[PDB]
Amino acid sequence: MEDFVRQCFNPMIVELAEKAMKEYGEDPKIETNKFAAICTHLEVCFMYSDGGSKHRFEIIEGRDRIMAWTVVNSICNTTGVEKPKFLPDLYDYKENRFIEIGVTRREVHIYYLEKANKIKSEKTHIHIFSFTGEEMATKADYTLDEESRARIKTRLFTIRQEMASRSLWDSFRQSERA
Numbered sequence: 001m002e003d004f005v006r007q008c009f010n011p012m013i014v015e016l017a018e019k020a021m022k023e024y025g026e027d028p029k030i031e032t033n034k035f036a037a038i039c040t041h042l043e044v045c046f047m048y049s050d051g052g053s054k055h056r057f058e059i060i061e062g063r064d065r066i067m068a069w070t071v072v073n074s075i076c077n078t079t080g081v082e083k084p085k086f087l088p089d090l091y092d093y094k095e096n097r098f099i100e101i102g103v104t105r106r107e108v109h110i111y112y113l114e115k116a117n118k119i120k121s122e123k124t125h126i127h128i129f130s131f132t133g134e135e136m137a138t139k140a141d142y143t144l145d146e147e148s149r150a151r152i153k154t155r156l157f158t159i160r161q162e163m164a165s166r167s168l169w170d171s172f173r174q175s176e177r178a
């Protein structure tokens, strides 16, 4: 699994993921499924941000904490949007709302409710993806065009397929907890 991550994700993504885990006191070489989940999530976030107009999205995930909240607070101050309690993943300039992205090894609906329950904030939009082609977004508003979405969904299947061809999928798939 460690070798899989290092081969399938780019070095920038792998460095951010390694850093995030170490910040929690976890070793990417040991909690290898979490390493892969974090990389996959980061990758999805970057793809989503590249999926509309140039400049449509501000990326929040992947920034250090200080720069993250600088972006968030600056956005809230300039748009008067409500200040979220937790850092979201992106801001959508066109819709004027924060986005929370989830990638799940379980099922799209359960993860959606878990995110909803954490968020509280009425405004932050939630969009969940799975590795089996499903998606789920607040008020069935999927934000991006279906071709952008299809590229994310396809990339996640392609990850799943690679993990399975290395016999990594079964363990990965059962590693996410409520």
Ligand SMILES: Cc1cn([C@H]2C[C@H](O)[C@@H](COP(=O)(O)O)O2)c(=O)[nH]c1=O
Binding pocket: 024, 037, 038, 041, 061, 088, 089, 101, 102, 103
């Ligand atoms: C906020 C947070 C996320 N994560 C992981 C869970 C997900 O795989 C990934 C992204 O989280 P997010 O979906 O809340 O943006 O980071 C942690 O391990 N610890 C944390 O404190």
Ligand SMILES: [Mn+2]
Binding pocket: 061, 087, 088, 089
């Ligand atoms: Mn995040």
Ligand SMILES: [Mn+2]
Binding pocket: 041, 089, 100, 101, 102
């Ligand atoms: Mn997220």
